[PDB]
Amino acid sequence: MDIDPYKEFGATVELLSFLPSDFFPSVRDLLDTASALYREALESPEHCSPHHTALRQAILCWGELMTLATWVGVNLEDPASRDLVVSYVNTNMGLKLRQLLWFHISCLTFGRETVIEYLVSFGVWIRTPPAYRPPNAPILSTLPETTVVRRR
Amino acid sequence: MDIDPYKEFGATVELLSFLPSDFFPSVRDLLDTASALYREALESPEHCSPHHTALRQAILCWGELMTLATWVGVNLEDPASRDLVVSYVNTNMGLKLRQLLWFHISCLTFGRETVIEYLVSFGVWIRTPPAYRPPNAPILSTLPETT
Amino acid sequence: MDIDPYKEFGATVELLSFLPSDFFPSVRDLLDTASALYREALESPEHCSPHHTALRQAILCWGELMTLATWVGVNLEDPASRDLVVSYVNTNMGLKLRQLLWFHISCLTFGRETVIEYLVSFGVWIRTPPAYRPPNAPILSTLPETTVVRR
Amino acid sequence: MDIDPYKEFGATVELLSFLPSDFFPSVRDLLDTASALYREALESPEHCSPHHTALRQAILCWGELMTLATWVGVNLEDPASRDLVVSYVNTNMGLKLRQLLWFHISCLTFGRETVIEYLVSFGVWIRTPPAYRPPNAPILSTLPETTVVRR
DSSP, rough: OOTTTTGGGGOHHHHHHTSHHHHHHHHHHHHHHHHHHHHHHHSSOOOOHHHHHHHHHHHHHHHHHHHHHHHHHOOOHHHHHHHHHHHIIIIHHHHHHHHHHHHHHHHSOOHHHHHHHHHHHHHHHEEEEEETSEEEEEEEEOOOTTTTOOOO | OOOOGGGGOOTTTTTTTTTTTSSSSSSSHHHHHHHHHHHHHSSSSSOOOHHHHHHHHHHHHHHHHHHHHHHHHHOOOOOOHHHHHHHHHHHHHHHHHOOOHHHHHHHHHHHHHHHHHHHHHHHHHSSOOOTTOSSOOOOOOOOOOOO | OOOTTTGTTOOHHHHHHSSSSTEEEEEEHHHHHHHHHHHHHHSSSSSOOOOHHHHHHHHHHHHHHHHHHHHHHHHHHOOHHHHHHHHIIIHHHHHHHHHHHHHHHHHHHHHHHHHHHHHHHHHHHHHHHHGGGGGSOOOOOOOOOSOOOOO | OOTTTTGGGGGGTTTTTTSSSGGGGOOHHHHHHHHHHHHHHTTTOOOOOHHHHHHHHHHHHHHHHHHHHHHHHHHHOOOOHHHHHHHHHIIHHHHHHHHHHHHHHHTTTTHHHHHHHHHHHHHHHHHHHHTOOOOSOOOSSSSSSSSSOOO
């Protein structure tokens, strides 16, 4: 039974596989973003959308790894293996979560069709050799390109 | 932020704590149950319901922990350290997952309102003193038993 | 009781903690802006807007902490104990004031719905990797863009 | 910046200066009256009235001085200084605040127009020399000091 976490949502793991690891915010930046934006919907006793249902499971998935990370510190006396496993939880298992947090926080912010269409145009850009492509990657942002929020 | 896992489904951590920790079927007995009944819906490119969405996440949460335990076997040359890590994952981290699989596999099979009532009714049984407690714990059943 | 100063205005304490602590201008820059713009309305018998009511209380709250810090200098001799309380008022308690002045002076100026989407947009901007975000930091302005003869 | 807290509510600082300093109940008694009657509206996600907006700011002003009162105790190593500045925060800074808490808690019950004409009437009473002054001062109440009811 091979489950594709994004296939339910119209994306694919191959489609998100082109985004470099530098693309994603840190796992703390994404938890702050979900907390400061969606937490009233995430803590509510409702299903708002499937992106909410999926973030709730992902945020708890990470909290149980952060229990493991703080566990191997107190309950493991070998210092060489304490920091070797914590490196794996933060760098490896964190990279797969950052990808998953980024996807649902973006589909709530920008809409799901916009994020999927952005991952196509970003893949076109990232597959182009650096000489033949524009130097700036495509941007996904709520800000105007000039920023300068103004009013209305 | 708190995010009680069960709250959007009508339960709470305090309501699933009526069940003892050793009540739950081993993770592999749960994965083979979902694989038997639900595999085609769990792998479909659709939103079937929120319980499907929450199983898909839980099953992937587990597969990434078994990757962790496969990694701890290869990459840790201390056998005295590797046991406490691999055992903590299969036991301590399995329990909180083993509760969450049991909940959604049972709400897909038996319905969600039946599983909430099962938790209340199992709490009445587990709270009864051992003298007056019936010998047979409550159990979820699909049988009207038609003839 | 637990009261959130921002909650009646559509914001929370974490939504203003979602921006860096050094984003907010100094207390004196914010008190100058209130007088250079909103003085007459803050001195009036009218209620005007709830941002005025909330901002009057904040300006007066800070006037009492400056009476305190002036009091401590005169009436508290021990210098190491004075530097702890004077710096605590100006920094730790000043940070919570800076956020509260900044929020109401900006909602009176730019609108409340604008400042709330600015806090969300500026905080997501700063957590994005630099290559993947617009190069310029967001900013609030009332000056219309390229209005005459450019558009 | 010369802001008057009460001017938007129809009073002044010298209209509340009719009431002696020791008239006002302790901050604890005033925070229990706001917590008893008004707590659900003070924590509400809405603007109930200007008196709510003013209490919300004032209850938060006191919460920050009780963090200062706690921080001084822990973070100052001189017992001569720590006990001197905490006395200022409780006594000196609490007087102006419990005068402010009294006014808004007294306006939410009884109404605002009643609390103003209570201040005028209590001044007429407190200015009267003690020989000609009646024994029973004015009082804010919704019911007589004796109320006959059948049940």
